[PDB]
Amino acid sequence: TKPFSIPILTIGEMTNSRFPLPIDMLYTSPTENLVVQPQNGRCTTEGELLGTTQLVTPSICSLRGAITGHEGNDDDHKWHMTVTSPNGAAFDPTEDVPAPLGTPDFTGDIYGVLSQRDRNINPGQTAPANRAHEAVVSTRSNKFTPKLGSVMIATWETTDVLQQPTKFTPVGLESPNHYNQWQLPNYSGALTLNMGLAPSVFPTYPGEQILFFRSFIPLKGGYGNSAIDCLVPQEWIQHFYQESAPSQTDVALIRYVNPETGRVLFEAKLHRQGFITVAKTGDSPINVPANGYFRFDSWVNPFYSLAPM
Amino acid sequence: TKPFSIPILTIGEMTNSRFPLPIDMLYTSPTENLVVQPQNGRCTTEGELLGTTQLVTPSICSLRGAITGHEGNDDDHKWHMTVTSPNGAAFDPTEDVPAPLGTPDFTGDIYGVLSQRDRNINPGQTAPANRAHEAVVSTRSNKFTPKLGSVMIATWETTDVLQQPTKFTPVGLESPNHYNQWQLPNYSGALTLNMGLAPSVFPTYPGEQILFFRSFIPLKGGYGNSAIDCLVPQEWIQHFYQESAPSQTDVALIRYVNPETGRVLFEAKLHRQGFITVAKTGDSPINVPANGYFRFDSWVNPFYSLAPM
């Protein structure tokens, strides 16, 4: 029975699993009136990846493939991007997954860079031509259809985008308008429901809330202090995936500890499904030292009563 | 005496430690005419970080701080960025490091996005304003002085940059002009030498070359198939940092294994200083399965004779 374990990296040493950003703080909040069902950042404590989760940090909310033309006829700023899997191989729309690995899992206008490196070398050259432009992938568009193998990608530039291999590097959001981090996009477009989903997560013990790892997400414009929350850091996913330690119950009692002073600061439940709950109500700040990290202490039963945070 | 170990993640599951990119291939080449002295991606096999190396993947080649105004009075595209440490805290120019952690470690015109979130809320508003623009940090500029707490950052945008907290998210290179991945920038500007450096690395056993983890790096324009090479993946750095396993000799014999068939494909030396050498000459392609990873097998004496790849 290989023992379960969690990384000893601090908050300040880890990366958000739902967007390639540093983790700025721990954060909790009531979620009784919404459905927390992210598809990136999903891993069981036994190392099973779920949803669209993959292990390469800069590929989170990235897209890869080629531009094949404009999307439609009536907007010169809109391009049809046929997408592949991150490894460059064809994606099978009938695969029992929501969309290609690392596809964005929220509703919003994602800002980043469209770059291209030509597949062919021109006469008189020794190397392929390149170009890049700022761009937006609107996951609420009816042409956001990654499960079918394509997305519409928009530019402010209106001509210098070729029918060439294309990558989208995510940077942030175009604005806070229409951003809802817990609303899954329609991976197959309009009037088609999503499939292959990692399940929703929620606390059940009275007075518990989900604990999130929160990152502030850049905005291209608008007023806001937008953030995106993940259930576990990307480094925890990489760790569980490698360790594949059996879970002895469905609940791991974990403690947040200051390694210098040895002081345990609070306790929490790491659920087998891959999320944390704490005995906390409200959204007030979580005040913890910088050198702190979670330590696995024991497997407990569903009803273990946590010390209130 | 804690045993040394290497992650079991495959090349296609890890990240470049010198730029936030997936790893595309293993790569070797002669370096007899170069000085290989990167400052990101530097970790001893005992977990000692060196140079400018830090653990947050999207912070590699990033810069944080605030714009104070234009750089000079003659180009409204050029801005003076005061730089902080990645945690937002003041950087001390006298600390025994080359530059703030994560600072770029090569010569080139680094392309990315400059984003800002205002520090105050304006009257009539409830949230701070935001803006972001394509930007270039030229590390060959005499105004690239991160060890002194500032860099010049340029935007195609001419005015919509304020004197506000600022992040630079790296995406790729503006072009291949003057890109030299092994030429350190002058962290303190002109006529001042760098200090606090992680040491240069080179093979010494006859017929050995350095083995690199190679990523293709996007280009905003120009002709080229530009790449950037790191000495070990970012996930190896995170692993060694946490494990802190003592190094029993200066050289770890490691084997690239196919986990499925269990077959060992080739062998290599992981040096305590934190780089890999192999018995290979030239730059011809390294042909290995997708599911392959390096496994630590034993500690060996200096000048151990490897099987030729």
Side-chain angles (χ1 to χ4, degrees):
Chain A
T1 179
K2 180 194 278 192
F4 179 69
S5 66
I6 296 170
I8 62 168
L9 297 170
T10 64
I11 299 318
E13 295 165 337
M14 291 188 289
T15 295
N16 199 291
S17 55
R18 290 186 60 224
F19 212 83
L21 301 164
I23 297 169
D24 293 293
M25 53 169 103
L26 302 175
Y27 180 80
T28 191
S29 159
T31 53
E32 57 207 71
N33 293 115
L34 54 103
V35 177
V36 175
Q37 200 166 7
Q39 302 298 306
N40 288 314
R42 302 295 303 265
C43 188
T44 66
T45 52
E46 295 196 334
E48 181 184 8
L49 310 177
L50 309 177
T52 58
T53 295
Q54 51 80 54
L55 299 167
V56 179
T57 297
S59 303
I60 301 165
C61 282
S62 182
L63 299 168
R64 193 185 155 151
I67 299 304
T68 57
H70 280 286
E71 185 75 58
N73 321 114
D74 53 72
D75 195 331
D76 283 352
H77 302 296
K78 288 183 189 323
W79 310 92
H80 191 271
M81 189 178 169
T82 299
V83 293
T84 69
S85 296
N87 63 3
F91 176 76
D92 178 1
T94 77
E95 203 202 336
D96 185 23
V97 286
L101 310 160
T103 298
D105 69 355
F106 59 92
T107 297
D109 301 332
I110 297 168
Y111 172 69
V113 172
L114 183 171
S115 66
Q116 311 193 307
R117 177 160 302 163
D118 291 354
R119 58 178 72 82
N120 49 332
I121 297 165
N122 292 342
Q125 302 290 349
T126 36
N130 298 259
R131 62 204 67 73
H133 308 289
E134 51 181 9
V136 172
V137 176
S138 177
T139 67
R140 65 206 171 88
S141 170
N142 58 10
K143 301 296 173 196
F144 185 76
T145 57
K147 170 71 159 173
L148 304 185
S150 72
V151 305
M152 177 273 291
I153 182 166
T155 53
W156 288 265
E157 172 71 26
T158 204
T159 59
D160 186 41
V161 178
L162 301 187
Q163 293 172 11
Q164 292 286 2
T166 301
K167 298 168 159 178
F168 179 67
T169 300
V171 175
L173 305 171
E174 182 186 24
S175 82
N177 301 331
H178 313 297
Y179 173 49
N180 184 342
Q181 76 167 317
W182 302 125
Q183 197 198 145
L184 293 172
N186 263 45
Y187 296 122
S188 289
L191 293 214
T192 306
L193 305 181
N194 296 330
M195 74 64 80
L197 293 184
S200 71
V201 301
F202 50 94
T204 50
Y205 188 102
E208 287 185 8
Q209 280 171 188
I210 294 165
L211 183 75
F212 299 98
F213 298 79
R214 168 163 280 206
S215 305
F216 293 112
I217 184 160
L219 290 169
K220 163 80 170 167
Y223 297 88
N225 188 26
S226 304
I228 190 161
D229 298 314
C230 68
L231 302 176
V232 297
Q234 186 68 4
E235 286 79 11
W236 287 25
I237 295 182
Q238 295 173 331
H239 186 79
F240 305 150
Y241 175 84
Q242 294 175 82
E243 290 290 301
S244 292
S247 308
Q248 302 302 304
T249 69
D250 292 335
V251 183
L253 176 65
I254 66 172
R255 262 74 172 254
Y256 205 79
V257 306
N258 169 320
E260 279 191 282
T261 79
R263 186 225 263 141
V264 166
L265 307 147
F266 70 91
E267 55 180 20
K269 280 169 179 162
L270 177 55
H271 296 277
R272 205 206 155 268
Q273 311 91 286
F275 71 112
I276 304 176
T277 60
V278 288
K280 195 163 152 76
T281 182
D283 73 348
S284 63
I286 298 176
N287 292 310
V288 285
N291 70 338
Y293 62 87
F294 281 108
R295 178 188 71 198
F296 168 69
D297 282 355
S298 55
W299 293 103
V300 298
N301 280 318
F303 52 82
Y304 182 96
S305 192
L306 296 175
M309 269 185 105
Chain B
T1 183
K2 183 192 224 149
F4 178 72
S5 70
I6 294 171
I8 62 171
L9 298 172
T10 65
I11 300 306
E13 297 168 338
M14 301 195 273
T15 298
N16 200 293
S17 56
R18 285 183 67 223
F19 212 84
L21 302 163
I23 297 166
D24 293 302
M25 68 182 70
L26 299 181
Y27 182 78
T28 193
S29 169
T31 53
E32 303 170 359
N33 315 320
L34 300 154
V35 172
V36 175
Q37 201 167 10
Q39 301 300 306
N40 288 315
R42 300 301 299 268
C43 188
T44 67
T45 51
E46 296 194 336
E48 181 181 12
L49 306 181
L50 310 171
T52 57
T53 294
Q54 50 81 55
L55 298 168
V56 178
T57 295
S59 300
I60 303 168
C61 271
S62 69
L63 295 174
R64 188 179 170 174
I67 293 308
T68 62
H70 284 288
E71 182 82 44
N73 77 345
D74 65 320
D75 186 339
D76 280 322
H77 296 128
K78 302 206 154 153
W79 310 92
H80 187 87
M81 205 176 151
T82 299
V83 294
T84 62
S85 292
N87 66 356
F91 179 76
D92 170 7
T94 79
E95 173 178 35
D96 176 61
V97 291
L101 300 188
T103 298
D105 71 355
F106 57 90
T107 296
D109 298 327
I110 301 170
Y111 168 68
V113 168
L114 179 172
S115 64
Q116 310 193 304
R117 185 160 295 166
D118 288 2
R119 56 174 77 78
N120 327 289
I121 294 145
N122 285 164
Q125 300 296 345
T126 59
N130 296 258
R131 64 208 63 73
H133 303 290
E134 288 176 283
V136 174
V137 176
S138 173
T139 68
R140 43 193 190 91
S141 168
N142 278 356
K143 303 318 172 43
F144 186 73
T145 61
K147 167 76 153 169
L148 305 181
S150 69
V151 307
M152 187 268 296
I153 185 162
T155 58
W156 289 267
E157 168 65 47
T158 45
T159 70
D160 188 38
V161 180
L162 306 185
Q163 285 162 141
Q164 291 290 346
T166 298
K167 302 158 137 173
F168 174 71
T169 298
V171 170
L173 306 175
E174 182 183 31
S175 80
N177 310 347
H178 308 137
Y179 174 48
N180 186 341
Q181 71 165 322
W182 300 126
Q183 181 186 153
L184 292 176
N186 265 38
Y187 297 113
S188 294
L191 301 199
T192 311
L193 304 176
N194 297 326
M195 62 64 68
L197 294 182
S200 74
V201 298
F202 48 96
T204 53
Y205 187 93
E208 283 185 11
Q209 281 175 182
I210 298 165
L211 186 73
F212 298 97
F213 297 84
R214 169 160 281 203
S215 301
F216 295 107
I217 183 165
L219 286 169
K220 166 77 164 167
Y223 296 89
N225 190 24
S226 307
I228 186 156
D229 294 315
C230 67
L231 303 177
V232 298
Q234 181 72 2
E235 286 76 10
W236 285 26
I237 293 175
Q238 295 177 327
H239 187 78
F240 303 155
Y241 178 78
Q242 294 178 77
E243 288 291 297
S244 301
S247 298
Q248 305 288 309
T249 74
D250 288 341
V251 185
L253 174 68
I254 65 176
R255 262 69 174 255
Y256 202 84
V257 308
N258 162 345
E260 188 167 67
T261 69
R263 186 161 74 170
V264 169
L265 292 324
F266 71 97
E267 55 178 21
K269 281 171 186 162
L270 173 55
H271 297 269
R272 179 193 173 291
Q273 311 94 281
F275 71 110
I276 305 175
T277 57
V278 288
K280 188 168 168 78
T281 42
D283 64 11
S284 68
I286 298 171
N287 289 316
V288 278
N291 69 333
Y293 62 86
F294 278 113
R295 177 188 70 205
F296 167 68
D297 278 354
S298 66
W299 292 100
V300 296
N301 274 330
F303 274 0
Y304 182 96
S305 195
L306 296 167
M309 281 166 89

mmCIF file of all heavy atoms in Angstrom, chain A residues 121-145:
data_model
loop_
_atom_site.group_PDB
_atom_site.id
_atom_site.type_symbol
_atom_site.label_atom_id
_atom_site.label_comp_id
_atom_site.label_asym_id
_atom_site.label_seq_id
_atom_site.Cartn_x
_atom_site.Cartn_y
_atom_site.Cartn_z
ATOM 1 N N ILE A 121 8.816 26.234 -46.928
ATOM 2 C CA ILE A 121 9.841 27.253 -47.129
ATOM 3 C C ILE A 121 9.664 27.846 -48.518
ATOM 4 O O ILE A 121 9.569 27.107 -49.501
ATOM 5 C CB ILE A 121 11.246 26.648 -46.969
ATOM 6 C CG1 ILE A 121 11.432 26.125 -45.545
ATOM 7 C CG2 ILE A 121 12.333 27.672 -47.292
ATOM 8 C CD1 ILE A 121 12.620 25.192 -45.395
ATOM 9 N N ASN A 122 9.642 29.169 -48.607
ATOM 10 C CA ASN A 122 9.401 29.846 -49.873
ATOM 11 C C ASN A 122 10.653 29.835 -50.751
ATOM 12 O O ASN A 122 11.771 29.620 -50.266
ATOM 13 C CB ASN A 122 8.960 31.284 -49.622
ATOM 14 C CG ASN A 122 7.590 31.369 -48.974
ATOM 15 O OD1 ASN A 122 6.821 30.412 -48.999
ATOM 16 N ND2 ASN A 122 7.285 32.514 -48.384
ATOM 17 N N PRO A 123 10.494 30.061 -52.057
ATOM 18 C CA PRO A 123 11.676 30.127 -52.925
ATOM 19 C C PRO A 123 12.548 31.306 -52.528
ATOM 20 O O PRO A 123 12.057 32.406 -52.263
ATOM 21 C CB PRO A 123 11.082 30.296 -54.328
ATOM 22 C CG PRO A 123 9.771 30.957 -54.094
ATOM 23 C CD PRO A 123 9.253 30.360 -52.804
ATOM 24 N N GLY A 124 13.850 31.062 -52.474
ATOM 25 C CA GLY A 124 14.795 32.069 -52.058
ATOM 26 C C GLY A 124 14.998 32.169 -50.565
ATOM 27 O O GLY A 124 15.775 33.024 -50.118
ATOM 28 N N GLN A 125 14.322 31.330 -49.782
ATOM 29 C CA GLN A 125 14.470 31.292 -48.339
ATOM 30 C C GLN A 125 15.022 29.938 -47.921
ATOM 31 O O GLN A 125 14.940 28.959 -48.659
ATOM 32 C CB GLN A 125 13.125 31.555 -47.637
ATOM 33 C CG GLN A 125 12.510 32.874 -48.003
ATOM 34 C CD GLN A 125 13.272 34.061 -47.444
ATOM 35 O OE1 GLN A 125 14.159 33.909 -46.610
ATOM 36 N NE2 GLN A 125 12.936 35.250 -47.924
ATOM 37 N N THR A 126 15.589 29.905 -46.713
ATOM 38 C CA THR A 126 16.011 28.676 -46.063
ATOM 39 C C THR A 126 15.142 28.291 -44.882
ATOM 40 O O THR A 126 15.316 27.192 -44.343
ATOM 41 C CB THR A 126 17.446 28.813 -45.532
ATOM 42 O OG1 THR A 126 17.637 30.149 -45.049
ATOM 43 C CG2 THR A 126 18.462 28.484 -46.619
ATOM 44 N N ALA A 127 14.280 29.178 -44.413
ATOM 45 C CA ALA A 127 13.478 28.912 -43.229
ATOM 46 C C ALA A 127 12.060 29.380 -43.465
ATOM 47 O O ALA A 127 11.811 30.289 -44.271
ATOM 48 C CB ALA A 127 14.030 29.604 -41.978
ATOM 49 N N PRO A 128 11.101 28.814 -42.744
ATOM 50 C CA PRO A 128 9.715 29.245 -42.902
ATOM 51 C C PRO A 128 9.464 30.632 -42.337
ATOM 52 O O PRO A 128 10.103 31.077 -41.378
ATOM 53 C CB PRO A 128 8.924 28.185 -42.128
ATOM 54 C CG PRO A 128 9.907 27.676 -41.091
ATOM 55 C CD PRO A 128 11.225 27.667 -41.827
ATOM 56 N N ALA A 129 8.493 31.307 -42.949
ATOM 57 C CA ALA A 129 8.022 32.593 -42.471
ATOM 58 C C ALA A 129 7.168 32.396 -41.223
ATOM 59 O O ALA A 129 6.587 31.325 -40.993
ATOM 60 C CB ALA A 129 7.208 33.297 -43.559
ATOM 61 N N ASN A 130 7.110 33.452 -40.409
ATOM 62 C CA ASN A 130 6.323 33.474 -39.190
ATOM 63 C C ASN A 130 5.498 34.755 -39.126
ATOM 64 O O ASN A 130 5.870 35.786 -39.699
ATOM 65 C CB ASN A 130 7.222 33.419 -37.962
ATOM 66 C CG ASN A 130 8.031 32.152 -37.881
ATOM 67 O OD1 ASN A 130 7.695 31.236 -37.138
ATOM 68 N ND2 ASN A 130 9.105 32.089 -38.646
ATOM 69 N N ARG A 131 4.399 34.691 -38.370
ATOM 70 C CA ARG A 131 3.654 35.880 -37.976
ATOM 71 C C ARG A 131 2.857 35.571 -36.712
ATOM 72 O O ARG A 131 2.483 34.421 -36.474
ATOM 73 C CB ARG A 131 2.713 36.325 -39.101
ATOM 74 C CG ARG A 131 1.657 35.286 -39.433
ATOM 75 C CD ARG A 131 1.136 35.470 -40.869
ATOM 76 N NE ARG A 131 2.185 35.166 -41.832
ATOM 77 C CZ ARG A 131 2.619 33.943 -42.094
ATOM 78 N NH1 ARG A 131 2.051 32.882 -41.553
ATOM 79 N NH2 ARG A 131 3.632 33.781 -42.937
ATOM 80 N N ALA A 132 2.613 36.613 -35.914
ATOM 81 C CA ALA A 132 1.807 36.536 -34.705
ATOM 82 C C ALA A 132 0.997 37.818 -34.553
ATOM 83 O O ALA A 132 1.427 38.908 -34.965
ATOM 84 C CB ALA A 132 2.671 36.305 -33.466
ATOM 85 N N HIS A 133 -0.179 37.675 -33.950
ATOM 86 C CA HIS A 133 -1.091 38.788 -33.711
ATOM 87 C C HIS A 133 -1.861 38.554 -32.421
ATOM 88 O O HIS A 133 -2.215 37.419 -32.095
ATOM 89 C CB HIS A 133 -2.118 38.960 -34.821
ATOM 90 C CG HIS A 133 -1.521 39.033 -36.187
ATOM 91 N ND1 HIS A 133 -0.798 40.120 -36.622
ATOM 92 C CD2 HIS A 133 -1.522 38.143 -37.205
ATOM 93 C CE1 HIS A 133 -0.386 39.900 -37.857
ATOM 94 N NE2 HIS A 133 -0.810 38.707 -38.232
ATOM 95 N N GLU A 134 -2.200 39.638 -31.732
ATOM 96 C CA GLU A 134 -3.137 39.474 -30.629
ATOM 97 C C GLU A 134 -4.491 38.986 -31.153
ATOM 98 O O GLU A 134 -4.918 39.290 -32.269
ATOM 99 C CB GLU A 134 -3.286 40.769 -29.819
ATOM 100 C CG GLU A 134 -3.565 41.991 -30.549
ATOM 101 C CD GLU A 134 -3.672 43.226 -29.629
ATOM 102 O OE1 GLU A 134 -3.354 43.159 -28.409
ATOM 103 O OE2 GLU A 134 -4.095 44.269 -30.153
ATOM 104 N N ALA A 135 -5.157 38.180 -30.343
ATOM 105 C CA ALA A 135 -6.322 37.454 -30.816
ATOM 106 C C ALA A 135 -7.211 37.122 -29.631
ATOM 107 O O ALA A 135 -6.776 37.155 -28.483
ATOM 108 C CB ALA A 135 -5.906 36.170 -31.532
ATOM 109 N N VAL A 136 -8.442 36.732 -29.936
ATOM 110 C CA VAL A 136 -9.439 36.394 -28.925
ATOM 111 C C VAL A 136 -10.140 35.109 -29.319
ATOM 112 O O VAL A 136 -10.574 34.948 -30.467
ATOM 113 C CB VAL A 136 -10.480 37.515 -28.755
ATOM 114 C CG1 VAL A 136 -11.633 37.062 -27.832
ATOM 115 C CG2 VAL A 136 -9.805 38.767 -28.207
ATOM 116 N N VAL A 137 -10.253 34.194 -28.375
ATOM 117 C CA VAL A 137 -11.058 32.989 -28.562
ATOM 118 C C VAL A 137 -12.259 33.153 -27.650
ATOM 119 O O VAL A 137 -12.141 33.026 -26.423
ATOM 120 C CB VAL A 137 -10.288 31.699 -28.235
ATOM 121 C CG1 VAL A 137 -11.235 30.459 -28.366
ATOM 122 C CG2 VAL A 137 -9.108 31.537 -29.131
ATOM 123 N N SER A 138 -13.415 33.448 -28.240
ATOM 124 C CA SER A 138 -14.653 33.611 -27.487
ATOM 125 C C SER A 138 -15.301 32.240 -27.284
ATOM 126 O O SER A 138 -15.811 31.638 -28.227
ATOM 127 C CB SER A 138 -15.582 34.562 -28.226
ATOM 128 O OG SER A 138 -16.813 34.660 -27.536
ATOM 129 N N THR A 139 -15.267 31.728 -26.059
ATOM 130 C CA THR A 139 -15.835 30.402 -25.849
ATOM 131 C C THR A 139 -17.355 30.406 -25.820
ATOM 132 O O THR A 139 -17.946 29.323 -25.755
ATOM 133 C CB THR A 139 -15.332 29.786 -24.555
ATOM 134 O OG1 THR A 139 -15.836 30.524 -23.448
ATOM 135 C CG2 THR A 139 -13.823 29.818 -24.517
ATOM 136 N N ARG A 140 -17.999 31.581 -25.838
ATOM 137 C CA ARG A 140 -19.458 31.638 -25.927
ATOM 138 C C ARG A 140 -19.968 31.714 -27.362
ATOM 139 O O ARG A 140 -21.176 31.627 -27.569
ATOM 140 C CB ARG A 140 -20.006 32.826 -25.136
ATOM 141 C CG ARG A 140 -19.598 34.144 -25.663
ATOM 142 C CD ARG A 140 -19.599 35.199 -24.548
ATOM 143 N NE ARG A 140 -18.995 36.446 -25.007
ATOM 144 C CZ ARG A 140 -19.652 37.420 -25.614
ATOM 145 N NH1 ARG A 140 -20.959 37.362 -25.796
ATOM 146 N NH2 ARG A 140 -18.979 38.480 -26.049
ATOM 147 N N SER A 141 -19.075 31.818 -28.349
ATOM 148 C CA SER A 141 -19.478 31.833 -29.746
ATOM 149 C C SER A 141 -20.120 30.512 -30.147
ATOM 150 O O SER A 141 -19.737 29.431 -29.683
ATOM 151 C CB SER A 141 -18.252 32.106 -30.634
ATOM 152 O OG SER A 141 -18.527 31.907 -32.019
ATOM 153 N N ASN A 142 -21.093 30.588 -31.055
ATOM 154 C CA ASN A 142 -21.657 29.344 -31.561
ATOM 155 C C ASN A 142 -20.684 28.600 -32.466
ATOM 156 O O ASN A 142 -20.919 27.418 -32.769
ATOM 157 C CB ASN A 142 -22.995 29.610 -32.279
ATOM 158 C CG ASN A 142 -22.870 30.568 -33.426
ATOM 159 O OD1 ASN A 142 -21.773 30.929 -33.835
ATOM 160 N ND2 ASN A 142 -24.011 30.989 -33.968
ATOM 161 N N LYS A 143 -19.583 29.237 -32.865
ATOM 162 C CA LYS A 143 -18.529 28.563 -33.610
ATOM 163 C C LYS A 143 -17.380 28.115 -32.728
ATOM 164 O O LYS A 143 -16.347 27.678 -33.253
ATOM 165 C CB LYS A 143 -18.008 29.468 -34.715
ATOM 166 C CG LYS A 143 -19.126 29.882 -35.699
ATOM 167 C CD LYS A 143 -19.697 28.696 -36.454
ATOM 168 C CE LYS A 143 -20.906 29.090 -37.298
ATOM 169 N NZ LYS A 143 -21.690 27.899 -37.741
ATOM 170 N N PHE A 144 -17.533 28.204 -31.405
ATOM 171 C CA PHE A 144 -16.638 27.509 -30.483
ATOM 172 C C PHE A 144 -17.084 26.051 -30.443
ATOM 173 O O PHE A 144 -17.998 25.691 -29.704
ATOM 174 C CB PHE A 144 -16.679 28.145 -29.094
ATOM 175 C CG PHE A 144 -15.682 27.541 -28.132
ATOM 176 C CD1 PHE A 144 -14.348 27.847 -28.223
ATOM 177 C CD2 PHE A 144 -16.082 26.657 -27.156
ATOM 178 C CE1 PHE A 144 -13.421 27.294 -27.357
ATOM 179 C CE2 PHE A 144 -15.146 26.097 -26.283
ATOM 180 C CZ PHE A 144 -13.816 26.425 -26.391
ATOM 181 N N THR A 145 -16.434 25.174 -31.222
ATOM 182 C CA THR A 145 -16.873 23.787 -31.331
ATOM 183 C C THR A 145 -15.664 22.866 -31.294
ATOM 184 O O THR A 145 -15.489 22.023 -32.170
ATOM 185 C CB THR A 145 -17.710 23.560 -32.592
ATOM 186 O OG1 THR A 145 -16.989 23.947 -33.776
ATOM 187 C CG2 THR A 145 -18.945 24.402 -32.566
#
